[PDB]
Design a protein around this nucleic acid. Structure first.
Length: 37
DNA sequence: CAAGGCACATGACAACGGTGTTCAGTGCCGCGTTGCCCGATACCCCCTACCCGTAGTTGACTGGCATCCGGGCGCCGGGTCGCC
């Protein structure tokens, strides 16, 4: 919580795992699995 | 000389004269009110032209922005970490 809220938003993005090909195709596979569920 | 007879006029008698008034009827000219006739005007319809909202567009493309000082000036007031 500081001034210039865009900076705090950027930190809120933080460090998250960027997705390579197989990672995201598996994610979409389980996405459609949950959709069918 | 007195009584009885005839003329003219006379107390009323209605009805004309002429003119003024009566109900009434109907108009005769003045003032105001009325049905027409149209004409325009609001108000339904149909047609399409155009404004405005929604939904797609697949090489890849993964963290920015320029701040800010030459007030100036002082106080309040609170926070804030050293201090022993």
């Amino acid at each position: 919580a500081t001034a210039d809220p865009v900076k705090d938003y950027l930190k809120q993005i933080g460090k998250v795992p960027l997705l390579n090909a197989e990672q995201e195709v598996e994610l979409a596979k389980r996405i459609e699995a949950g959709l069918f569920a």
